[PDB]
């Protein structure tokens, strides 16, 4: 079995790999990479992904989010409050201002100590699941607005058809942003590339052990969980490496510069931060080994999980007995 210490795996694909993403998604997966729960793809050095960043700041960020933190330091929720609009050149001034900029650090090491120690005790404001694209139409691989869909990978594997659209998300980081403990929508894939700007730390759970992250999360949010079986999918909850390391839970840690790429497997748990001024696009997708998971995922009917509209057909072919309960929560 390969990766069985579900060790992050980090790849260099030639100029050549890079032409195909499906094969070589199944290359890594060849190699055990899925294992982690999280790769890092680095780009050959041919590649680009846009000639220039110099013409993004009259994007608009319409609501940004106000990130507020409830409990102790190293277990704690967080709340999303909306703010005014405003542009990216408007945002970077922001993130750059005493208030939210980087503190003076020494290493990677030393700015991971300091968020964890003071990340509740501030705010930062997140410019988050913006739809969009920052890829040049003219660039032809990796380009994450133009991969298959997921709607076509169900229909080539199931013979299904179904309406839904599977498009990109920007999103605008600062120091301290925060991305709570969560694997994919129906446990889909994910695909990360950090465009700007300063890194992105990420955590991650191996799948095979995903249930011991649950069983935690259930014991440490326990009125969350009182409300909801499936709470981790309302992306609130977050959990340090040492409490993490206290309760014996499996994870492993990495972080992400401009540049790279990450992709997130099948009900891989993470969770991270930014380290200051930055801009990522994400997207979900699918391959055939993705179905089985699709079909196990929970879901959260209480709710407050709210997702998009292409979600539904998921639900409704891969689990009809859960259907009619979750479109409640929907509605
Ligand atoms: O970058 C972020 O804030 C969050 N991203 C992801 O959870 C992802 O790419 O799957
Ligand atoms: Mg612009
Ligand atoms: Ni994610
Ligand atoms: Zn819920």
Redo the contacts with the bound molecule.
């Keep these: 079995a390969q990766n069985p210490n579900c060790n992050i795996m980090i790849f260099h694909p030639t100029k050549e790999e890079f032409n195909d993403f499906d094969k070589y998604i199944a290359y890594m997966e060849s190699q055990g990479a899925h294992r982690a729960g999280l790769a890092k793809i680095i780009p050959p050095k041919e590649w680009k992904a846009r000639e220039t960043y110099d013409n993004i700041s009259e994007i608009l960020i319409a609501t940004p989010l106000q990130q507020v933190a409830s409990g102790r330091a190293g277990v704690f929720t967080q709340y999303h409050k909306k703010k005014k609009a405003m542009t990216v050149g408007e945002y970077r001034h922001l993130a750059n201002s005493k208030k939210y900029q980087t503190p003076p650090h020494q290493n990677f090491e030393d700015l991971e100590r300091k968020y964890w120690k003071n990340r509740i005790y501030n705010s930062p404001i997140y410019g988050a699941d913006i739809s969009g694209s920052l890829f040049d139409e003219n660039t032809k691989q990796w380009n994450l607005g133009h991969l298959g869909t997921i709607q076509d990978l169900l229909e080539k594997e199931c013979g299904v058809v179904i309406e839904g659209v599977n498009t990109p998300y920007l999103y605008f980081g600062m120091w301290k942003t925060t ?1 709570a403990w ?3 929508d129906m446990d889909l894939y ?1 695909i ?1 590339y950090l465009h700007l700007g300063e890194p992105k730390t990420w955590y991650v759970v191996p799948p095979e052990h995903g249930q011991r992250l649950e069983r935690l999360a259930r014991e440490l949010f326990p009125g969350s969980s009182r409300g909801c079986g499936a709470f981790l999918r309302h992306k609130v909850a977050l959990i340090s490496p040492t409490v993490l390391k206290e309760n014996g839970i499996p994870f492993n840690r990495i972080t992400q510069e401009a540049g790279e790429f990450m992709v ?1 497997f099948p009900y891989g748990y ?1 969770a991270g931060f930014n380290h200051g001024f930055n801009c990522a696009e ?1 997207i979900n997708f699918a391959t055939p080994r993705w179905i089985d998971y699709g079909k196990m995922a929970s879901q959260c009917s209480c709710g407050e999980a709210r997702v998009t509209f292409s979600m539904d057909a998921f639900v409704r072919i891969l689990q009809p007995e859960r259907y009619d309960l979750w479109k409640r929560g929907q509605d």
């Design positions: 991305f969560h694997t994919e994910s990360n997130t993470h994400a």
